[PDB]
Protein: Protease 2A
Organism: Coxsackievirus A16
Amino acid sequence: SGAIYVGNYRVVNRHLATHNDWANLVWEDSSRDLLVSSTTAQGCDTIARCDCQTGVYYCSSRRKHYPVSFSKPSLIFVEASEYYPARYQSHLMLAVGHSEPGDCGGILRCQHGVVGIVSTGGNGLVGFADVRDLLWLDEE
Ligand SMILES: COCc1nnc(N)s1
Ligand SMILES: [Zn+2]
């Protein structure tokens, strides 16, 4: 579990969005595993605006943050998980590391701020849904 809290936006994995998220929906994309909802209180996070390929992510199933190198966001085939069938996922970055389903929502961060959230795992990789292209998160 986990979210990004930027301005008056909550960014969550689409598959973990609540009824309240859907009732306060700003934007969602199943192909990216992302959903954004509106918040009453302003959030503490800053979105990275960069093309870094190194950062640190939080792994809940280890209670640990790991430094990783990761691929640039791409359209990637993802094998079946507990929460999605085998399918193509867009705007996905991969790193070598541990990820189980409950790790989804952990933040990946670089020197510029939040890069994305854990979205995929298995076979010794962790996949992250990028948010750095979502420039509208920074205003309004
Ligand atoms: C296509 O759906 C976008 C949205 N729907 N309700 C909102 N409040 S934003
Ligand atoms: Zn960066």
